[PDB]
Amino acid sequence: DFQSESYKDAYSRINAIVIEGEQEAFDNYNRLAEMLPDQRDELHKLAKMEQRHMKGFMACGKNLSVTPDMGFAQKYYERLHENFKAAAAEGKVVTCLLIQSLIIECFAIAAYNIYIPVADAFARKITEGVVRDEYLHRNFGEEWLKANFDASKAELEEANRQNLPLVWLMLNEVADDARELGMERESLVEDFMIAYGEALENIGFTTREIMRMSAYGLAA
Ligand SMILES: CCCCCCCCCCCCCCCCO
Ligand SMILES: [Fe+2]
Ligand SMILES: [Fe+2]
User: Fold this and answer.
1) What residues are in contact with ligand 1 under a 6 Å CB criterion?
2) Which of 10, 14, 207, 219 could crosslink 180 through cysteines, CB 3.0-4.6 Å?
3) Whole domain around residue 149: which residue ranges?
4) Could you please report the per-residue DSSP string of 39-106?
5) 145 C-alpha vs ligand 1 centroid, how far in Å?
6) 119: which DSSP letter?
7) 178 with 126: CB under 8 angstroms?
8) Distance between CA 96 and CA 99 in Å, rounded?
């Protein structure tokens, strides 16, 4: 349990996934800072927080004597990451904000909070510090999208349709290794659906709209 060979194998993929995720979050928020001049300094602050998270999780892996399987993690994020990239190239800020500040942050919040109670004491302290920042990142995107809801609504719907299923696939792909780390799938699914559904309601979506938007992920 922590030093077991089964735990260490699963941690190799999970730890690689969180590190790769933080690294991409870093790049994502820097690109967003390019696209949103009025919030350029705030977004740069979010990016610097991501760099800290990445470093903290690299340390978690070293503490369990685990080599992160980065190749597995690259492939894990590829589709969703390339979608961000493409949206960024076409100037689609709304899509980029949805992917990184809503969908990805909600996923991280739900998984990290599930990991905390079963995490070794060193990783538990790191993750507690990390999840504190994730609330702020999600709050940034919700606040912006809520303030710009009418202009953003049509693109949000389209972005959700294309990208929510990718994250569900990512949630499903990670479920086995997560269980080995003592994180139950059913907790992950419920918590992610609740957080993302609640964030959509806060932004301004109706119930039928939230059910429609959620169902694109769940049917995948
Ligand atoms: C060592 C941490 C354990 C939790 C593992 C969670 C399993 C997969 C979810 C990964 C989500 C990473 C997203 C990071 C984005 C940060 O803004
Ligand atoms: Fe982060
Ligand atoms: Fe984040």
Assistant:
1) 14-15, 17-18, 21-22, 25, 50, 57, 60, 104-105, 107-108, 111-112, 115, 123, 127, 174, 178
2) 10
3) 4-220
4) GHHHHHHHHHHHHHHHHHHHHHHHHTT----HHHHHHHHHHHHHHHHHHHHTT-HHHHHIIIIIIIHH
5) 23
6) S
7) no
8) 5
Gap from CA of 104 to ligand 1 centroid (Å): 9
Exposure of 178 in the CB half-sphere (CA atoms within 13 A): 22
> Is residue 22 annotated as involved in ligand binding?
yes
- Which atom of ligand 1 lies nearest, measured to the CA of 171? 8
Which residue is associated with the tokens 């705030």?
Answer: 42
Distance, in Å, from the CA atom of 129 to the CA atom of 120, rounded to the nearest integer, reads 14
Listed residue (58, 57, 32) closest to 45, CA to CA: 32
Distance, in Å, from the CA atom of 17 to the CA atom of 218, rounded to the nearest integer, reads: 22
Domain count, the chain: 1
Q: What does the alpha-carbon distance between residue 159 and residue 71 come to, in Å, rounded to a whole number?
A: 27
Token readout for 32 is 């967003």
Task: Give the resolution in Å.
Answer: 2.2
The annotation status of 81 as a binding-site residue, yes or no, is no
C-alpha 95/C-alpha 100 separation (Å) is: 9
CATH number at residue 196: 1.20.1260.10
* For ligand 1, atom 14: residue with the closest CA: 21
How many CB atoms within 10 Å of residue 187? Answer: 14
Is 53 annotated to bind a ligand? Reply is yes
